[PDB]
Structures are given as C-alpha cells and as structure tokens.
PDB file of all heavy atoms in Angstrom:
ATOM      1  N   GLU O 278     174.252 -45.292 196.252  1.00 59.22           N
ATOM      2  CA  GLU O 278     174.208 -44.030 195.651  1.00 59.22           C
ATOM      3  C   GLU O 278     172.977 -43.169 196.071  1.00 59.22           C
ATOM      4  O   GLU O 278     173.173 -42.016 196.457  1.00 59.22           O
ATOM      5  CB  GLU O 278     174.376 -44.128 194.133  1.00 59.22           C
ATOM      6  CG  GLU O 278     174.756 -42.891 193.424  1.00 59.22           C
ATOM      7  CD  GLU O 278     175.702 -43.123 192.298  1.00 59.22           C
ATOM      8  OE1 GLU O 278     175.695 -44.332 191.861  1.00 59.22           O
ATOM      9  OE2 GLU O 278     176.336 -42.144 191.773  1.00 59.22           O
ATOM     10  N   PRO O 279     171.721 -43.678 195.979  1.00 54.29           N
ATOM     11  CA  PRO O 279     170.608 -42.782 196.199  1.00 54.29           C
ATOM     12  C   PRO O 279     170.523 -42.208 197.609  1.00 54.29           C
ATOM     13  O   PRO O 279     169.594 -41.470 197.875  1.00 54.29           O
ATOM     14  CB  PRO O 279     169.417 -43.717 195.952  1.00 54.29           C
ATOM     15  CG  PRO O 279     169.908 -44.769 195.108  1.00 54.29           C
ATOM     16  CD  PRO O 279     171.292 -44.999 195.440  1.00 54.29           C
ATOM     17  N   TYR O 280     171.505 -42.493 198.498  1.00 53.68           N
ATOM     18  CA  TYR O 280     171.427 -41.977 199.846  1.00 53.68           C
ATOM     19  C   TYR O 280     172.665 -41.203 200.295  1.00 53.68           C
ATOM     20  O   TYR O 280     172.706 -40.746 201.431  1.00 53.68           O
ATOM     21  CB  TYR O 280     171.222 -43.140 200.773  1.00 53.68           C
ATOM     22  CG  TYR O 280     170.184 -44.135 200.360  1.00 53.68           C
ATOM     23  CD1 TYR O 280     170.622 -45.351 199.840  1.00 53.68           C
ATOM     24  CD2 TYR O 280     168.838 -43.852 200.435  1.00 53.68           C
ATOM     25  CE1 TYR O 280     169.708 -46.302 199.539  1.00 53.68           C
ATOM     26  CE2 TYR O 280     167.928 -44.800 199.991  1.00 53.68           C
ATOM     27  CZ  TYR O 280     168.334 -46.004 199.500  1.00 53.68           C
ATOM     28  OH  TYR O 280     167.487 -46.908 199.156  1.00 53.68           O
ATOM     29  N   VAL O 281     173.691 -41.001 199.464  1.00 47.99           N
ATOM     30  CA  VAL O 281     174.860 -40.386 199.877  1.00 47.99           C
ATOM     31  C   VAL O 281     175.351 -39.415 198.848  1.00 47.99           C
ATOM     32  O   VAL O 281     174.816 -39.256 197.784  1.00 47.99           O
ATOM     33  CB  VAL O 281     175.976 -41.367 200.216  1.00 47.99           C
ATOM     34  CG1 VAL O 281     175.640 -42.319 201.317  1.00 47.99           C
ATOM     35  CG2 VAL O 281     176.293 -42.277 198.912  1.00 47.99           C
ATOM     36  N   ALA O 282     176.385 -38.595 199.182  1.00 49.72           N
ATOM     37  CA  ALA O 282     177.132 -37.747 198.332  1.00 49.72           C
ATOM     38  C   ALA O 282     178.578 -37.958 198.571  1.00 49.72           C
ATOM     39  O   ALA O 282     179.027 -37.885 199.692  1.00 49.72           O
ATOM     40  CB  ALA O 282     176.677 -36.276 198.617  1.00 49.72           C
ATOM     41  N   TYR O 283     179.302 -38.193 197.462  1.00 49.86           N
ATOM     42  CA  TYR O 283     180.752 -38.447 197.635  1.00 49.86           C
ATOM     43  C   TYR O 283     181.554 -37.726 196.540  1.00 49.86           C
ATOM     44  O   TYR O 283     180.949 -37.105 195.610  1.00 49.86           O
ATOM     45  CB  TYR O 283     181.043 -39.908 197.656  1.00 49.86           C
ATOM     46  CG  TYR O 283     180.508 -40.745 196.471  1.00 49.86           C
ATOM     47  CD1 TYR O 283     181.365 -41.283 195.488  1.00 49.86           C
ATOM     48  CD2 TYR O 283     179.159 -41.086 196.410  1.00 49.86           C
ATOM     49  CE1 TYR O 283     180.932 -41.992 194.493  1.00 49.86           C
ATOM     50  CE2 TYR O 283     178.713 -41.840 195.391  1.00 49.86           C
ATOM     51  CZ  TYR O 283     179.549 -42.333 194.365  1.00 49.86           C
ATOM     52  OH  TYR O 283     179.075 -43.030 193.377  1.00 49.86           O
ATOM     53  N   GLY O 284     182.871 -37.871 196.605  1.00 49.92           N
ATOM     54  CA  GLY O 284     183.776 -37.136 195.756  1.00 49.92           C
ATOM     55  C   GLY O 284     185.185 -37.338 196.251  1.00 49.92           C
ATOM     56  O   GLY O 284     185.438 -38.086 197.139  1.00 49.92           O
ATOM     57  N   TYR O 285     186.046 -36.460 195.648  1.00 51.57           N
ATOM     58  CA  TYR O 285     187.487 -36.591 195.862  1.00 51.57           C
ATOM     59  C   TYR O 285     188.108 -35.474 196.757  1.00 51.57           C
ATOM     60  O   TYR O 285     188.152 -34.346 196.271  1.00 51.57           O
ATOM     61  CB  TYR O 285     188.258 -36.628 194.520  1.00 51.57           C
ATOM     62  CG  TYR O 285     187.676 -37.505 193.506  1.00 51.57           C
ATOM     63  CD1 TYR O 285     187.611 -37.159 192.209  1.00 51.57           C
ATOM     64  CD2 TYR O 285     187.091 -38.771 193.888  1.00 51.57           C
ATOM     65  CE1 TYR O 285     187.001 -37.957 191.227  1.00 51.57           C
ATOM     66  CE2 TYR O 285     186.561 -39.553 192.939  1.00 51.57           C
ATOM     67  CZ  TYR O 285     186.551 -39.127 191.616  1.00 51.57           C
ATOM     68  OH  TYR O 285     185.981 -40.006 190.680  1.00 51.57           O
ATOM     69  N   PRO O 286     188.421 -35.692 197.973  1.00 49.49           N
ATOM     70  CA  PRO O 286     188.734 -34.583 198.885  1.00 49.49           C
ATOM     71  C   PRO O 286     190.168 -34.025 198.682  1.00 49.49           C
ATOM     72  O   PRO O 286     191.085 -34.815 198.503  1.00 49.49           O
ATOM     73  CB  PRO O 286     188.678 -35.225 200.245  1.00 49.49           C
ATOM     74  CG  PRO O 286     189.010 -36.663 200.091  1.00 49.49           C
ATOM     75  CD  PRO O 286     188.615 -37.032 198.669  1.00 49.49           C
ATOM     76  N   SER O 287     190.222 -32.704 198.664  1.00 48.37           N
ATOM     77  CA  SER O 287     191.568 -32.039 198.435  1.00 48.37           C
ATOM     78  C   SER O 287     192.358 -32.253 199.697  1.00 48.37           C
ATOM     79  O   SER O 287     191.992 -32.936 200.660  1.00 48.37           O
ATOM     80  CB  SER O 287     191.317 -30.561 198.147  1.00 48.37           C
ATOM     81  OG  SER O 287     192.428 -29.873 198.566  1.00 48.37           O
ATOM     82  N   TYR O 288     193.519 -31.513 199.751  1.00 46.90           N
ATOM     83  CA  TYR O 288     194.400 -31.598 200.985  1.00 46.90           C
ATOM     84  C   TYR O 288     193.821 -30.659 202.054  1.00 46.90           C
ATOM     85  O   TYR O 288     193.880 -31.010 203.244  1.00 46.90           O
ATOM     86  CB  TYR O 288     195.776 -31.229 200.578  1.00 46.90           C
ATOM     87  CG  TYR O 288     196.668 -30.869 201.752  1.00 46.90           C
ATOM     88  CD1 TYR O 288     197.160 -31.869 202.618  1.00 46.90           C
ATOM     89  CD2 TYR O 288     196.959 -29.502 202.074  1.00 46.90           C
ATOM     90  CE1 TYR O 288     197.914 -31.483 203.712  1.00 46.90           C
ATOM     91  CE2 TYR O 288     197.716 -29.208 203.117  1.00 46.90           C
ATOM     92  CZ  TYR O 288     198.165 -30.194 203.989  1.00 46.90           C
ATOM     93  OH  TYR O 288     199.020 -29.806 204.999  1.00 46.90           O
ATOM     94  N   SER O 289     193.342 -29.430 201.639  1.00 47.72           N
ATOM     95  CA  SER O 289     193.034 -28.426 202.595  1.00 47.72           C
ATOM     96  C   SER O 289     191.703 -28.862 203.362  1.00 47.72           C
ATOM     97  O   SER O 289     191.560 -28.563 204.592  1.00 47.72           O
ATOM     98  CB  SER O 289     192.790 -27.090 201.986  1.00 47.72           C
ATOM     99  OG  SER O 289     191.443 -26.805 201.780  1.00 47.72           O
ATOM    100  N   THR O 290     190.818 -29.561 202.742  1.00 47.43           N
ATOM    101  CA  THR O 290     189.554 -29.937 203.382  1.00 47.43           C
ATOM    102  C   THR O 290     189.848 -31.087 204.347  1.00 47.43           C
ATOM    103  O   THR O 290     189.277 -31.154 205.455  1.00 47.43           O
ATOM    104  CB  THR O 290     188.523 -30.340 202.371  1.00 47.43           C
ATOM    105  OG1 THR O 290     188.622 -31.783 202.152  1.00 47.43           O
ATOM    106  CG2 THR O 290     188.726 -29.589 201.118  1.00 47.43           C
ATOM    107  N   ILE O 291     190.747 -32.003 204.013  1.00 46.35           N
ATOM    108  CA  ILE O 291     191.199 -33.008 204.866  1.00 46.35           C
ATOM    109  C   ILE O 291     191.808 -32.352 206.184  1.00 46.35           C
ATOM    110  O   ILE O 291     191.552 -32.736 207.277  1.00 46.35           O
ATOM    111  CB  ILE O 291     192.132 -34.046 204.250  1.00 46.35           C
ATOM    112  CG1 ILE O 291     191.358 -34.983 203.300  1.00 46.35           C
ATOM    113  CG2 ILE O 291     192.889 -34.776 205.311  1.00 46.35           C
ATOM    114  CD1 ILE O 291     192.266 -35.995 202.721  1.00 46.35           C
ATOM    115  N   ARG O 292     192.671 -31.380 205.878  1.00 49.11           N
ATOM    116  CA  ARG O 292     193.338 -30.704 206.956  1.00 49.11           C
ATOM    117  C   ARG O 292     192.382 -30.051 207.901  1.00 49.11           C
ATOM    118  O   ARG O 292     192.462 -30.163 209.147  1.00 49.11           O
ATOM    119  CB  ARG O 292     194.308 -29.607 206.382  1.00 49.11           C
ATOM    120  CG  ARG O 292     194.895 -28.683 207.403  1.00 49.11           C
ATOM    121  CD  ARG O 292     196.110 -28.022 206.912  1.00 49.11           C
ATOM    122  NE  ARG O 292     196.469 -26.923 207.690  1.00 49.11           N
ATOM    123  CZ  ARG O 292     195.993 -25.703 207.450  1.00 49.11           C
ATOM    124  NH1 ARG O 292     195.083 -25.494 206.496  1.00 49.11           N
ATOM    125  NH2 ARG O 292     196.385 -24.650 208.177  1.00 49.11           N
ATOM    126  N   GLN O 293     191.402 -29.354 207.334  1.00 50.19           N
ATOM    127  CA  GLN O 293     190.396 -28.616 208.135  1.00 50.19           C
ATOM    128  C   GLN O 293     189.575 -29.603 208.931  1.00 50.19           C
ATOM    129  O   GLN O 293     189.306 -29.389 210.152  1.00 50.19           O
ATOM    130  CB  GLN O 293     189.459 -27.811 207.227  1.00 50.19           C
ATOM    131  CG  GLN O 293     190.163 -26.614 206.709  1.00 50.19           C
ATOM    132  CD  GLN O 293     189.192 -25.719 205.991  1.00 50.19           C
ATOM    133  OE1 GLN O 293     188.013 -26.063 205.823  1.00 50.19           O
ATOM    134  NE2 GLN O 293     189.618 -24.547 205.567  1.00 50.19           N
ATOM    135  N   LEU O 294     189.066 -30.730 208.356  1.00 48.63           N
ATOM    136  CA  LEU O 294     188.300 -31.701 208.972  1.00 48.63           C
ATOM    137  C   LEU O 294     189.104 -32.271 210.202  1.00 48.63           C
ATOM    138  O   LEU O 294     188.636 -32.219 211.353  1.00 48.63           O
ATOM    139  CB  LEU O 294     187.958 -32.876 208.049  1.00 48.63           C
ATOM    140  CG  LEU O 294     186.713 -32.652 207.145  1.00 48.63           C
ATOM    141  CD1 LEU O 294     186.462 -33.851 206.306  1.00 48.63           C
ATOM    142  CD2 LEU O 294     185.499 -32.296 207.955  1.00 48.63           C
ATOM    143  N   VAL O 295     190.287 -32.778 209.935  1.00 50.16           N
ATOM    144  CA  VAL O 295     191.054 -33.407 211.025  1.00 50.16           C
ATOM    145  C   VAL O 295     191.420 -32.397 212.126  1.00 50.16           C
ATOM    146  O   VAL O 295     191.348 -32.778 213.306  1.00 50.16           O
ATOM    147  CB  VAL O 295     192.347 -34.053 210.429  1.00 50.16           C
ATOM    148  CG1 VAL O 295     193.327 -34.384 211.561  1.00 50.16           C
ATOM    149  CG2 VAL O 295     192.026 -35.328 209.690  1.00 50.16           C
ATOM    150  N   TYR O 296     191.629 -31.188 211.802  1.00 51.92           N
ATOM    151  CA  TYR O 296     191.991 -30.138 212.754  1.00 51.92           C
ATOM    152  C   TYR O 296     190.831 -29.730 213.605  1.00 51.92           C
ATOM    153  O   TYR O 296     190.953 -29.441 214.835  1.00 51.92           O
ATOM    154  CB  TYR O 296     192.727 -28.936 212.159  1.00 51.92           C
ATOM    155  CG  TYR O 296     194.235 -29.087 212.140  1.00 51.92           C
ATOM    156  CD1 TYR O 296     194.817 -29.818 211.135  1.00 51.92           C
ATOM    157  CD2 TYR O 296     194.904 -28.557 213.127  1.00 51.92           C
ATOM    158  CE1 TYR O 296     196.217 -29.956 211.150  1.00 51.92           C
ATOM    159  CE2 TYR O 296     196.357 -28.690 213.139  1.00 51.92           C
ATOM    160  CZ  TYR O 296     196.920 -29.432 212.121  1.00 51.92           C
ATOM    161  OH  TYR O 296     198.326 -29.583 212.082  1.00 51.92           O
ATOM    162  N   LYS O 297     189.629 -29.663 213.081  1.00 50.37           N
ATOM    163  CA  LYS O 297     188.509 -29.085 213.748  1.00 50.37           C
ATOM    164  C   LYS O 297     187.501 -30.104 214.320  1.00 50.37           C
ATOM    165  O   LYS O 297     187.046 -29.957 215.447  1.00 50.37           O
ATOM    166  CB  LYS O 297     187.786 -28.122 212.820  1.00 50.37           C
ATOM    167  CG  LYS O 297     186.420 -27.654 213.372  1.00 50.37           C
ATOM    168  CD  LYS O 297     185.665 -26.738 212.484  1.00 50.37           C
ATOM    169  CE  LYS O 297     184.346 -26.388 212.956  1.00 50.37           C
ATOM    170  NZ  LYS O 297     183.410 -25.928 211.876  1.00 50.37           N
ATOM    171  N   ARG O 298     187.119 -31.080 213.560  1.00 50.94           N
ATOM    172  CA  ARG O 298     186.158 -32.086 213.933  1.00 50.94           C
ATOM    173  C   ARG O 298     186.763 -33.455 214.013  1.00 50.94           C
ATOM    174  O   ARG O 298     186.108 -34.486 213.647  1.00 50.94           O
ATOM    175  CB  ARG O 298     184.913 -32.097 213.058  1.00 50.94           C
ATOM    176  CG  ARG O 298     184.429 -30.692 212.652  1.00 50.94           C
ATOM    177  CD  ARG O 298     183.084 -30.800 211.966  1.00 50.94           C
ATOM    178  NE  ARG O 298     182.015 -30.765 212.948  1.00 50.94           N
ATOM    179  CZ  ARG O 298     181.213 -29.700 213.156  1.00 50.94           C
ATOM    180  NH1 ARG O 298     181.419 -28.621 212.521  1.00 50.94           N
ATOM    181  NH2 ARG O 298     180.298 -29.777 214.050  1.00 50.94           N
ATOM    182  N   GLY O 299     188.065 -33.583 214.417  1.00 53.09           N
ATOM    183  CA  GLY O 299     188.699 -34.894 214.528  1.00 53.09           C
ATOM    184  C   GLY O 299     188.812 -35.536 215.885  1.00 53.09           C
ATOM    185  O   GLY O 299     189.398 -34.821 216.752  1.00 53.09           O
ATOM    186  N   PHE O 300     188.139 -36.640 216.069  1.00 52.76           N
ATOM    187  CA  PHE O 300     188.182 -37.277 217.319  1.00 52.76           C
ATOM    188  C   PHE O 300     188.727 -38.732 217.171  1.00 52.76           C
ATOM    189  O   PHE O 300     188.312 -39.435 216.264  1.00 52.76           O
ATOM    190  CB  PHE O 300     186.683 -37.359 217.918  1.00 52.76           C
ATOM    191  CG  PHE O 300     186.141 -36.040 218.288  1.00 52.76           C
ATOM    192  CD1 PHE O 300     185.766 -35.109 217.377  1.00 52.76           C
ATOM    193  CD2 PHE O 300     186.035 -35.728 219.618  1.00 52.76           C
ATOM    194  CE1 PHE O 300     185.272 -33.931 217.742  1.00 52.76           C
ATOM    195  CE2 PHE O 300     185.498 -34.504 219.940  1.00 52.76           C
ATOM    196  CZ  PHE O 300     185.124 -33.569 219.058  1.00 52.76           C
ATOM    197  N   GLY O 301     189.644 -39.104 218.001  1.00 56.35           N
ATOM    198  CA  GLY O 301     190.297 -40.383 217.938  1.00 56.35           C
ATOM    199  C   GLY O 301     189.388 -41.474 218.617  1.00 56.35           C
ATOM    200  O   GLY O 301     188.291 -41.211 218.972  1.00 56.35           O
ATOM    201  N   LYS O 302     190.022 -42.636 218.847  1.00 55.86           N
ATOM    202  CA  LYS O 302     189.372 -43.714 219.459  1.00 55.86           C
ATOM    203  C   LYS O 302     190.326 -44.466 220.388  1.00 55.86           C
ATOM    204  O   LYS O 302     191.024 -45.331 219.890  1.00 55.86           O
ATOM    205  CB  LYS O 302     188.706 -44.641 218.425  1.00 55.86           C
ATOM    206  CG  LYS O 302     187.502 -45.337 218.894  1.00 55.86           C
ATOM    207  CD  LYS O 302     187.042 -46.348 217.825  1.00 55.86           C
ATOM    208  CE  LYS O 302     188.077 -47.394 217.579  1.00 55.86           C
ATOM    209  NZ  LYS O 302     187.517 -48.366 216.562  1.00 55.86           N
ATOM    210  N   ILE O 303     190.409 -44.059 221.638  1.00 55.15           N
ATOM    211  CA  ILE O 303     191.243 -44.817 222.575  1.00 55.15           C
ATOM    212  C   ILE O 303     190.452 -45.959 223.102  1.00 55.15           C
ATOM    213  O   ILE O 303     189.663 -45.883 224.054  1.00 55.15           O
ATOM    214  CB  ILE O 303     191.767 -43.908 223.721  1.00 55.15           C
ATOM    215  CG1 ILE O 303     190.571 -43.241 224.442  1.00 55.15           C
ATOM    216  CG2 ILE O 303     192.706 -42.887 223.195  1.00 55.15           C
ATOM    217  CD1 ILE O 303     190.582 -43.370 225.913  1.00 55.15           C
ATOM    218  N   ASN O 304     190.470 -47.084 222.316  1.00 50.44           N
ATOM    219  CA  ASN O 304     189.879 -48.415 222.590  1.00 50.44           C
ATOM    220  C   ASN O 304     188.311 -48.296 222.529  1.00 50.44           C
ATOM    221  O   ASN O 304     187.675 -49.337 222.308  1.00 50.44           O
ATOM    222  CB  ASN O 304     190.323 -48.926 223.967  1.00 50.44           C
ATOM    223  CG  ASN O 304     189.648 -48.311 225.169  1.00 50.44           C
ATOM    224  OD1 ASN O 304     188.554 -47.972 225.229  1.00 50.44           O
ATOM    225  ND2 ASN O 304     190.425 -48.087 226.243  1.00 50.44           N
ATOM    226  N   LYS O 305     187.861 -47.110 222.619  1.00 52.57           N
ATOM    227  CA  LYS O 305     186.412 -46.748 222.546  1.00 52.57           C
ATOM    228  C   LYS O 305     186.328 -45.220 222.630  1.00 52.57           C
ATOM    229  O   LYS O 305     187.378 -44.569 222.415  1.00 52.57           O
ATOM    230  CB  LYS O 305     185.593 -47.357 223.722  1.00 52.57           C
ATOM    231  CG  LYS O 305     185.160 -48.792 223.513  1.00 52.57           C
ATOM    232  CD  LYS O 305     184.690 -49.103 222.111  1.00 52.57           C
ATOM    233  CE  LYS O 305     184.530 -50.593 221.909  1.00 52.57           C
ATOM    234  NZ  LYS O 305     185.535 -51.377 222.693  1.00 52.57           N
ATOM    235  N   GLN O 306     185.178 -44.701 222.876  1.00 54.32           N
ATOM    236  CA  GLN O 306     184.907 -43.441 223.703  1.00 54.32           C
ATOM    237  C   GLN O 306     185.178 -42.116 222.928  1.00 54.32           C
ATOM    238  O   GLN O 306     184.796 -41.080 223.439  1.00 54.32           O
ATOM    239  CB  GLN O 306     185.902 -43.379 224.914  1.00 54.32           C
ATOM    240  CG  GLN O 306     185.836 -44.459 225.861  1.00 54.32           C
ATOM    241  CD  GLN O 306     185.645 -43.968 227.317  1.00 54.32           C
ATOM    242  OE1 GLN O 306     185.979 -42.847 227.663  1.00 54.32           O
ATOM    243  NE2 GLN O 306     185.164 -44.905 228.171  1.00 54.32           N
ATOM    244  N   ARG O 307     185.509 -42.102 221.651  1.00 58.85           N
ATOM    245  CA  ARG O 307     185.508 -40.887 220.908  1.00 58.85           C
ATOM    246  C   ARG O 307     186.204 -39.673 221.632  1.00 58.85           C
ATOM    247  O   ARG O 307     185.543 -38.730 222.031  1.00 58.85           O
ATOM    248  CB  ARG O 307     184.114 -40.456 220.533  1.00 58.85           C
ATOM    249  CG  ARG O 307     184.000 -39.345 219.502  1.00 58.85           C
ATOM    250  CD  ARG O 307     182.613 -38.943 219.201  1.00 58.85           C
ATOM    251  NE  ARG O 307     182.553 -37.863 218.195  1.00 58.85           N
ATOM    252  CZ  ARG O 307     182.154 -36.612 218.516  1.00 58.85           C
ATOM    253  NH1 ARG O 307     181.760 -36.336 219.682  1.00 58.85           N
ATOM    254  NH2 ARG O 307     182.151 -35.710 217.572  1.00 58.85           N
ATOM    255  N   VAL O 308     187.523 -39.812 221.813  1.00 57.94           N
ATOM    256  CA  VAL O 308     188.245 -38.844 222.503  1.00 57.94           C
ATOM    257  C   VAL O 308     188.750 -37.742 221.483  1.00 57.94           C
ATOM    258  O   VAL O 308     189.203 -38.028 220.380  1.00 57.94           O
ATOM    259  CB  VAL O 308     189.509 -39.449 223.181  1.00 57.94           C
ATOM    260  CG1 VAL O 308     189.056 -40.089 224.489  1.00 57.94           C
ATOM    261  CG2 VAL O 308     190.151 -40.482 222.314  1.00 57.94           C
ATOM    262  N   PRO O 309     188.695 -36.518 221.928  1.00 60.15           N
ATOM    263  CA  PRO O 309     189.170 -35.426 221.056  1.00 60.15           C
ATOM    264  C   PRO O 309     190.718 -35.297 221.052  1.00 60.15           C
ATOM    265  O   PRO O 309     191.371 -35.523 222.061  1.00 60.15           O
ATOM    266  CB  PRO O 309     188.566 -34.149 221.644  1.00 60.15           C
ATOM    267  CG  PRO O 309     188.530 -34.439 223.134  1.00 60.15           C
ATOM    268  CD  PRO O 309     188.332 -35.930 223.200  1.00 60.15           C
ATOM    269  N   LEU O 310     191.286 -35.004 219.848  1.00 60.49           N
ATOM    270  CA  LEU O 310     192.741 -35.146 219.716  1.00 60.49           C
ATOM    271  C   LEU O 310     193.420 -34.009 220.547  1.00 60.49           C
ATOM    272  O   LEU O 310     194.080 -34.329 221.553  1.00 60.49           O
ATOM    273  CB  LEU O 310     193.081 -35.045 218.313  1.00 60.49           C
ATOM    274  CG  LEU O 310     192.675 -36.314 217.504  1.00 60.49           C
ATOM    275  CD1 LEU O 310     193.372 -36.417 216.186  1.00 60.49           C
ATOM    276  CD2 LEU O 310     192.854 -37.546 218.341  1.00 60.49           C
ATOM    277  N   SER O 311     193.317 -32.821 220.131  1.00 60.47           N
ATOM    278  CA  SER O 311     193.846 -31.639 220.895  1.00 60.47           C
ATOM    279  C   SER O 311     195.315 -31.795 221.309  1.00 60.47           C
ATOM    280  O   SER O 311     195.792 -30.984 222.113  1.00 60.47           O
ATOM    281  CB  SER O 311     193.009 -31.414 222.175  1.00 60.47           C
ATOM    282  OG  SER O 311     193.377 -32.410 223.130  1.00 60.47           O
ATOM    283  N   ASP O 312     196.026 -32.719 220.797  1.00 60.79           N
ATOM    284  CA  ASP O 312     197.426 -33.019 221.189  1.00 60.79           C
ATOM    285  C   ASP O 312     198.039 -34.075 220.381  1.00 60.79           C
ATOM    286  O   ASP O 312     197.287 -34.894 219.716  1.00 60.79           O
ATOM    287  CB  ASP O 312     197.448 -33.424 222.667  1.00 60.79           C
ATOM    288  CG  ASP O 312     198.672 -32.979 223.371  1.00 60.79           C
ATOM    289  OD1 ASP O 312     199.694 -32.852 222.664  1.00 60.79           O
ATOM    290  OD2 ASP O 312     198.665 -32.769 224.668  1.00 60.79           O
ATOM    291  N   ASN O 313     199.331 -34.207 220.423  1.00 63.83           N
ATOM    292  CA  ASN O 313     200.029 -35.256 219.640  1.00 63.83           C
ATOM    293  C   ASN O 313     200.414 -36.420 220.590  1.00 63.83           C
ATOM    294  O   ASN O 313     200.762 -37.523 220.038  1.00 63.83           O
ATOM    295  CB  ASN O 313     201.336 -34.668 219.040  1.00 63.83           C
ATOM    296  CG  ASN O 313     201.074 -33.721 217.982  1.00 63.83           C
ATOM    297  OD1 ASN O 313     200.140 -33.902 217.163  1.00 63.83           O
ATOM    298  ND2 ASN O 313     201.875 -32.662 217.889  1.00 63.83           N
ATOM    299  N   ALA O 314     200.376 -36.269 221.861  1.00 64.15           N
ATOM    300  CA  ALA O 314     200.581 -37.368 222.763  1.00 64.15           C
ATOM    301  C   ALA O 314     199.522 -38.462 222.591  1.00 64.15           C
ATOM    302  O   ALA O 314     199.839 -39.660 222.629  1.00 64.15           O
ATOM    303  CB  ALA O 314     200.602 -36.900 224.237  1.00 64.15           C
ATOM    304  N   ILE O 315     198.247 -38.081 222.416  1.00 63.38           N
ATOM    305  CA  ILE O 315     197.174 -39.016 222.250  1.00 63.38           C
ATOM    306  C   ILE O 315     197.364 -39.824 220.973  1.00 63.38           C
ATOM    307  O   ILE O 315     197.054 -40.991 220.873  1.00 63.38           O
ATOM    308  CB  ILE O 315     195.827 -38.289 222.313  1.00 63.38           C
ATOM    309  CG1 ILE O 315     195.673 -37.579 223.659  1.00 63.38           C
ATOM    310  CG2 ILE O 315     194.627 -39.283 222.076  1.00 63.38           C
ATOM    311  CD1 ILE O 315     194.461 -36.667 223.729  1.00 63.38           C
ATOM    312  N   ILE O 316     197.785 -39.155 219.927  1.00 64.34           N
ATOM    313  CA  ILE O 316     198.056 -39.846 218.637  1.00 64.34           C
ATOM    314  C   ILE O 316     199.249 -40.795 218.776  1.00 64.34           C
ATOM    315  O   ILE O 316     199.246 -41.901 218.303  1.00 64.34           O
ATOM    316  CB  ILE O 316     198.205 -38.849 217.513  1.00 64.34           C
ATOM    317  CG1 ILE O 316     197.091 -37.960 217.338  1.00 64.34           C
ATOM    318  CG2 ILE O 316     198.550 -39.546 216.206  1.00 64.34           C
ATOM    319  CD1 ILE O 316     197.391 -36.490 216.932  1.00 64.34           C
ATOM    320  N   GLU O 317     200.343 -40.306 219.414  1.00 63.89           N
ATOM    321  CA  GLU O 317     201.592 -41.071 219.463  1.00 63.89           C
ATOM    322  C   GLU O 317     201.380 -42.328 220.242  1.00 63.89           C
ATOM    323  O   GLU O 317     201.865 -43.394 219.929  1.00 63.89           O
ATOM    324  CB  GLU O 317     202.670 -40.249 219.968  1.00 63.89           C
ATOM    325  CG  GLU O 317     203.968 -40.914 220.237  1.00 63.89           C
ATOM    326  CD  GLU O 317     204.754 -40.319 221.465  1.00 63.89           C
ATOM    327  OE1 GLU O 317     204.876 -39.060 221.465  1.00 63.89           O
ATOM    328  OE2 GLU O 317     205.189 -41.079 222.295  1.00 63.89           O
ATOM    329  N   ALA O 318     200.838 -42.167 221.478  1.00 61.99           N
ATOM    330  CA  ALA O 318     200.621 -43.338 222.416  1.00 61.99           C
ATOM    331  C   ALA O 318     199.685 -44.367 221.811  1.00 61.99           C
ATOM    332  O   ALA O 318     199.680 -45.568 222.328  1.00 61.99           O
ATOM    333  CB  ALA O 318     200.176 -42.855 223.736  1.00 61.99           C
TER     334      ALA O 318
END
C-alpha cells in the first residue's frame, strides 16, 4: 500500500487504456496491437 494507488476501473477507462496504450506480447517484444490479426493469431 505505501507505494501504489489502486481502485476499481470502469468500462470506459479500460476501453481507453486498451485502445491507446495497449501493447501485446508476441512471445516477447511488446508489440503494438493496431489490428485484430495480431490478437487472433
């Protein structure tokens, strides 16, 4: 607790986070999503 801030995220903030600063992980490497093919494969 003395080092973090937490709480209960709404739907719109999750949506914004995933859409704007969301990067996947293709085995490594922090790849940006920008597409549904990367998620699906």
Side-chain angles (χ1 to χ4, degrees):
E278 199 144 15
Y280 317 106
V281 295
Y283 54 106
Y285 314 141
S287 154
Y288 163 78
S289 103
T290 91
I291 286 180
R292 166 158 167 278
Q293 290 188 351
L294 280 181
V295 165
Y296 267 82
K297 169 184 178 204
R298 321 190 85 105
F300 291 75
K302 209 184 66 180
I303 55 130
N304 75 39
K305 279 320 169 323
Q306 302 230 339
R307 191 181 179 248
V308 280
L310 290 196
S311 73
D312 212 332
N313 294 323
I315 300 172
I316 302 147
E317 171 212 315

